[PDB]
């Protein structure tokens, strides 16, 4: 497909662009770049296509090719690690005055019934794969003041958890926190996955 | 000088990507004519400079990996960081204890091992992230006996400046040392041999 090719081309041009802006890039390289820029512009018009749009489309094609890569020398795993929490934040000391604990989906859910009227955000350190959650390592609930008042942790002593298991556990946690007019928010990385 | 070998490598790797695209049977004739012609042209440029293509492709891969990471404009950014796990979650999670503690801070890394361990075969497993074919951020490394018992650890320190892949190789050496002085025989994981060393 002429269209598929063109998208890939606009995207690769874009990368050779950023490269030339990193101000590496020798003479004939900046020559080809200029020539390809003219070429693409006209191919754009002939195809009645929008370059910014077409660049975006080829980005998704190129992406899939790299994640598809079976070559050993170049292969990437790929699972990836997202950290919402600093190291200090994960291992930190916390206690509950009026503790509530609940195993669900191979996940241990905890919260302090005593806490009231706080604004709380849910931060999780966890791995993603294929644009969804793979393994949850830890998720903790923090008041505006950074105090920890809740935590969902994996139980490894028994089978693995889904991202379904996790999203459920969260919802169960928010709903417990809200009883005491706590307003509970969720990180933007927890929002996807 | 180097900007020309810099320019050469991206060209090599970008050709490769074009190749994988063409392999999917997606390109039209001009694209393929273009693929063909640039392969020949790339063959010339590596005879003259004096460069290996497979290696330069590899070289340009992280140059592009870089660019895709620093990409402003979210709709185009591609994260270059990846996550390797040698340990299970029960392993990563397990509490363990040293009969005879011996531990050491090394700049944002705690190095721990059990002095009571002698004449054993030990493997070092680690969960960590890696980037641009270099280790990026270690999460946990544990040292296991044949029977699965934890007898050592390297673990990141929380309140401190970031550690580096160098910080981590060094720390590994200090540990294998500690362990071999106790006459244990120490093997490192494949991920570790490839990345951390």
From Swiss-Prot, chain B:
Motif position, Nuclear export signal: 131-140
Any one GO MF annotation of this record: RNA binding
Motif (Nuclear localization signal): 33-37
Keyword annotations from UniProtKB, A to Z: Eukaryotic host gene expression shutoff by virus, Host cytoplasm, Host gene expression shutoff by virus, Host mRNA suppression by virus, Host nucleus, Host-virus interaction, Inhibition of host innate immune response by virus, Inhibition of host interferon signaling pathway by virus, Inhibition of host PKR by virus, Inhibition of host pre-mRNA processing by virus, Inhibition of host RIG-I by virus, Inhibition of host RLR pathway by virus, Interferon antiviral system evasion, RNA-binding, Viral immunoevasion
Compartments (UniProt record): Host nucleus; Host cytoplasm
GO biological process entries: symbiont-mediated suppression of host cytoplasmic pattern recognition receptor signaling pathway via inhibition of RIG-I activity; symbiont-mediated suppression of host gene expression; symbiont-mediated suppression of host mRNA processing; symbiont-mediated suppression of host PKR/eIFalpha signaling; symbiont-mediated suppression of host type I interferon-mediated signaling pathway
Positions of the UniProt region annotated as RNA-binding and homodimerization: 1-72
Keyword RNA-binding: yes
SUPFAM superfamilies per record: Ns1 effector domain-like (SSF143021), S15/NS1 RNA-binding domain (SSF47060)
Main subcellular localisation: host cell
Region (CPSF4-binding): 174-197
Transmembrane segments: none
Phosphoprotein listed as a keyword: no
Any one Gene Ontology cellular component term annotated for this protein: host cell cytoplasm
Domains: entry comment: The dsRNA-binding region is required for suppression of RNA silencing.
Function: Inhibits post-transcriptional processing of cellular pre-mRNA, by binding and inhibiting two cellular proteins that are required for the 3'-end processing of cellular pre-mRNAs: the 30 kDa cleavage and polyadenylation specificity factor/CPSF4 and the poly(A)-binding protein 2/PABPN1. In turn, unprocessed 3' end pre-mRNAs accumulate in the host nucleus and are no longer exported to the cytoplasm. Cellular protein synthesis is thereby shut off very early after virus infection.
Family recorded in the similarity comment: Belongs to the influenza A viruses NS1 family.
HAMAP family: INFV_NS1
Subunit structure: Forms homodimers and higher-order oligomers. Interacts with host TRIM25 (via coiled coil); this interaction specifically inhibits TRIM25 multimerization and TRIM25-mediated RIGI CARD ubiquitination. Interacts with human EIF2AK2/PKR, CPSF4, IVNS1ABP and PABPN1. Interacts with human DLG1 (via PDZ domains 1 and 2) and human SCRIB; the interaction results in the translocation of DLG1 and SCRIB from the cell membrane to perinuclear puncta. Interacts indirectly with human LIN7C via its interaction with DLG1, the interaction facilitates translocation of LIN7C to cytoplasmic puncta.
Protein name per the record: Non-structural protein 1
Organism: Influenza A virus (strain A/Blue-winged teal/Minnesota/993/1980 H6N6)
